[PDB]
Design a protein around this ligand. Structure first.
Ligand SMILES: *[C@@H]1O[C@H](CO)[C@@H](O[C@@H]2O[C@H](CO)[C@@H](O)[C@H](O)[C@H]2NC(C)=O)[C@H](O)[C@H]1NC(C)=O
Ligand SMILES: *[C@@H]1O[C@H](CO)[C@@H](O[C@@H]2O[C@H](CO)[C@@H](O)[C@H](O)[C@H]2NC(C)=O)[C@H](O)[C@H]1NC(C)=O
Ligand SMILES: *[C@@H]1O[C@H](CO)[C@@H](O[C@@H]2O[C@H](CO)[C@@H](O)[C@H](O)[C@H]2NC(C)=O)[C@H](O)[C@H]1NC(C)=O
Ligand SMILES: *[C@@H]1O[C@H](CO)[C@@H](O[C@@H]2O[C@H](CO)[C@@H](O)[C@H](O)[C@H]2NC(C)=O)[C@H](O)[C@H]1NC(C)=O
Ligand SMILES: *[C@@H]1O[C@H](CO)[C@@H](O[C@@H]2O[C@H](CO)[C@@H](O)[C@H](O)[C@H]2NC(C)=O)[C@H](O)[C@H]1NC(C)=O
Ligand SMILES: *[C@@H]1O[C@H](CO)[C@@H](O[C@@H]2O[C@H](CO)[C@@H](O)[C@H](O)[C@H]2NC(C)=O)[C@H](O)[C@H]1NC(C)=O
Ligand SMILES: *[C@@H]1O[C@H](CO)[C@@H](O)[C@H](O)[C@H]1NC(C)=O
Ligand SMILES: *[C@@H]1O[C@H](CO)[C@@H](O)[C@H](O)[C@H]1NC(C)=O
Ligand SMILES: *[C@@H]1O[C@H](CO)[C@@H](O)[C@H](O)[C@H]1NC(C)=O
Ligand SMILES: *[C@@H]1O[C@H](CO)[C@@H](O)[C@H](O)[C@H]1NC(C)=O
Lengths: 366, 236, 49
């Protein structure tokens, strides 16, 4: 009171010092049950991959993709993310995903990178220097390599020009090294651009087959549809907490309600655009929101010149959550709020320091 | 497998009165016993609705479609700009068991019709992007509202049992939201699909305009009455 | 080639203004606890130029 009034003496009366509010306890978040997972299993666990010059292209849209299991699994030899850090994929997301899968040698792993050159980087698959996404590679010697030689896989080696970014050429035309024309028959200056991989179980590290899949994420102006699951938690009641119900955030105490939401609404507001009820996306029940209590505090004093003991009144606050003045002296609950530091008597005198609702206090104690 | 028919489908392009039909819930907010004013795209009261008894019609901002359907002759809808493989095309079909929604660059024939003895009205279907399957949409008045805003395709629907003879009844019935599509296409025209046996269909079409409306919400959150704030001085 | 200059590349959180960090500890990028052992999901936070 002295600090607010900015004086070392205080006359008899009631003064308003500060405010009081109930702090939130913890946080909760609610989100739907999560479904429609993206089919990564059918891509990475595919029985047969295509050749590098005929890389399989897959389009992914309208699903939830969990990269946590992909990152945590150590079965992948090479895990190179260039556009963004792997930990942030689950937070933000793009409008579509493209997966390009093939099998290459163990030495040609670094050819699949921005600003890289080589036979693969210039004849089979090309990445732009501004490419964003990730690359996954893992050995498949026990499966792709054959004891008789996995001659099915082929690589392009001969072409007049290079390959454009995300461009595939599968032409089997006889390349003409020189100026001598060929009638479809390979000669001195004519050769087949495609040659076979020769994987065997005993070939050495580096020549072993490696399955490689590159993921590119694109953000066309269409709304984004594919990214990670939204974490959720349980819910509490009868406690002032803050909540994030399906993107709608706010504080208050949540109770059970008897309102009948028609089967397609999500949340309700009464007037002046203030939310009153919500529907949790999992249990599908209607709850009720109430702002947890707050109010101003006041001090009743008989004057510094007379005494030095005071009384404290909390305005419009039920005497259930008051909290050194938590217990103090006898507590009196009145129509104007709650009062600590004074005694209620059965007599009735004139009014000295008005309090409210027909009651007031005076110094005798108070 | 699509061939142009001999007779012309010259349907009489009549006009009639809209009365007070074409009201839909604008959002997903519950309100109880309150009057709320909102500005959005609606069908003006007592407007002029076109009656067809199969031309390509403009889409404009949105479309209100109505049919006093008997024995399910209407089957679906086609949406697009060039109606060929040069541009993405939307297709909706409600066959006997399911509803199928596709977004592909079809090659439609000059007179698409579903045929009877599933989809053969297109010569080809390439570069498909979006697919969707759900429960069937369908004396029986079927009302639909189609809108396309910022890459979102909204479909609102309502079914009503009617006993009136010819024209739209004098009454109020709000349209509940049905389906949302997160796909971006700059649709400008559309077409109706019929399954006519190889060997007399009437519907109503109206257009939407931006304006302000006042809606009344009862205790249970249902819209029971509305007022157009630009019809006459009393309404204002 | 000069390699006397190195910069930090990984940190648990951001830096408050006018602070200095010189500690050189392994970075546990993944869920696997490195426990001072360099390997998968464990990288040296200092990168040369
Ligand atoms: C490919 O299949 C294997 C084998 O089923 C999958 O590995 C399993 O992953 C689950 C989920 O993490 C684990 O609970 C199992 O213990 C794993 N099994 C083995 C033998 O490792 C793998 O996740 C699949 N790959 C994809 C991309 O779905
Ligand atoms: C979301 O998932 C939860 C958990 O699977 C579903 O809760 C189940 O609901 C059924 C139907 O009453 C009960 O028999 C189960 O005991 C519930 N399980 C749990 C763990 O609570 C819930 O119904 C799902 N909601 C939606 C909208 O899919
Ligand atoms: C302060 O809160 C308590 C706790 O709710 C209130 O006590 C309730 O009073 C009503 C009305 O008589 C009863 O129906 C409830 O059963 C009581 N609850 C409990 C837990 O006993 C009290 O009334 C509140 N103070 C004021 C002034 O209303
Ligand atoms: C009505 O449409 C549904 C949806 O396409 C048809 O059901 C599908 O039929 C195809 C035909 O080969 C099957 O491959 C799908 O598995 C079916 N899906 C479902 C959910 O049933 C149905 O056959 C159509 N009915 C008629 C009479 O044409
Ligand atoms: C066939 O589909 C592809 C991919 O869905 C379309 O490629 C798009 O082309 C436009 C033209 O500039 C780009 O802006 C998009 O980023 C491309 N990818 C998309 C939309 O995913 C291609 O246009 C389609 N073919 C036709 C004739 O429409
Ligand atoms: C609004 O909801 C109330 C409460 O559910 C409805 O009142 C019920 O109406 C039915 C008639 O079908 C009666 O059998 C019940 O006894 C009524 N219950 C109560 C508590 O009133 C009411 O019909 C709904 N519609 C309107 C327009 O009020
Ligand atoms: C106020 O103080 C003066 C002197 O300090 C004293 O004479 C007077 O009685 C006091 N008034 C009271 C106690 O009401
Ligand atoms: C006196 O006040 C107390 C509460 O302070 C009350 O319980 C008691 O009944 C009152 N007595 C009379 C005679 O009013
Ligand atoms: C609706 O349009 C027709 C066609 O011209 C016209 O005859 C009729 O009067 C119009 N109805 C109105 C404007 O209410
Ligand atoms: C539709 O066409 C208009 C005009 O050509 C263009 O501005 C708009 O971006 C297009 N929308 C698409 C292609 O989704």
């Amino acid at each position: 009171t002295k600090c607010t009034l900015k004086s070392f003496t205080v006359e008899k009366g009631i003064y308003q010092t500060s405010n009081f509010r109930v702090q939130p306890t913890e946080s909760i978040v609610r989100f739907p049950n999560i479904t429609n997972l993206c089919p990564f299993g059918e891509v990475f666990n595919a029985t047969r991959f295509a050749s590098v010059y005929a890389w399989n292209r897959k389009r992914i849209s309208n699903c939830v993709a969990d990269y946590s299991v992909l990152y945590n699994s150590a079965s992948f030899s090479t895990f190179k993310c260039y556009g963004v850090s792997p930990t942030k994929l689950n937070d933000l997301c793009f409008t579509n995903v493209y997966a390009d899968s093939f099998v290459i040698r163990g030495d040609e792993v670094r050819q699949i990178a921005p600003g890289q050159t080589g036979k693969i980087a210039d004849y089979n698959y090309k990445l732009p220097d501004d490419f964003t996404g990730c690359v996954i590679a893992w050995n498949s010697n026990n499966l792709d390599s054959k004891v008789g030689g996995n001659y099915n896989y082929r690589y392009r080696l001969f072409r007049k020009s290079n390959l454009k970014p995300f461009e595939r050429d599968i032409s089997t035309e006889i390349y003409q090294a020189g100026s001598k024309p060929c009638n479809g028959v390979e000669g001195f200056n004519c050769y087949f651009p495609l040659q076979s991989y020769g994987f065997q179980p005993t070939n050495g590290v580096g020549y072993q087959p490696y399955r490689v899949v590159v993921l590119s994420f694109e953000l066309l102006h269409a709304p984004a549809t594919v990214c990670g699951p939204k974490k959720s938690t349980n819910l509490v009641k009868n406690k002032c907490v803050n909540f994030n119900f399906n993107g709608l955030t706010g504080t208050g105490v949540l109770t059970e309600s008897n309102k009948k939401f028609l089967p397609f609404q999500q949340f309700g507001r009464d007037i002046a655009d203030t939310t009153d009820a919500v529907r949790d996306p999992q249990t599908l029940e209607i709850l009720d929101i109430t702002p947890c209590s707050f109010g101003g505090v006041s001090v009743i004093t008989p004057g510094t010149n007379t005494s030095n003991q005071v009384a404290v009144l909390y305005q419009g606050v039920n005497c259930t959550e008051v909290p050194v003045y938590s217990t103090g002296s006898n507590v009196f609950q009145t129509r104007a709020g709650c009062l600590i530091g004074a005694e209620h008597v059965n007599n009735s005198y004139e009014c000295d320091i008005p309090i409210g609702a027909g009651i007031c206090a005076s110094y005798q104690s108070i | 497998q699509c061939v142009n028919l001999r007779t012309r489908t010259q349907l009489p392009p009549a006009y009639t009165n809209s009365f007070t039909r074409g009201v839909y819930y604008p959002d997903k907010v519950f309100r109880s016993s309150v009057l709320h004013s909102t500005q959005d795209l609606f069908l003006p009261f007592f407007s002029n609705v076109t009656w067809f008894h199969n031309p390509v019609l403009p889409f404009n901002d949105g479309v209100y479609f109505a049919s006093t359907e008997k024995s399910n002759i209407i089957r679906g809808w086609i949406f697009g700009t060039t109606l060929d493989s040069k541009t993405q095309s939307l297709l909706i079909v409600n066959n006997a068991t399911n509803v199928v929604i596709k977004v592909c660059e079809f090659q439609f024939c000059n007179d698409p019709f579903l045929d009877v003895y599933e989809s053969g009205v297109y010569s080809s279907a390439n570069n498909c992007t979006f697919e969707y399957v759900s429960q069937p949409f369908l004396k029986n008045l079927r009302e639909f509202v189609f809108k396309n805003i910022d890459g979102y395709f909204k479909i609102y629907s309502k079914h009503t049992p009617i006993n009136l003879v010819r024209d739209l009844p004098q009454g109020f019935s709000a349209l509940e939201p049905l389906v949302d599509l997160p796909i971006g296409i700059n649709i400008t025209r559309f077409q109706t699909l019929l399954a006519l046996h190889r060997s007399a269909a009437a519907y109503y079409v109206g257009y939407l305009q931006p304006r302000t409306f006042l809606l009344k919400y009862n205790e249970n959150g249902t819209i029971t009455d509305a007022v157009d704030c630009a019809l006459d001085p009393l309404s204002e």
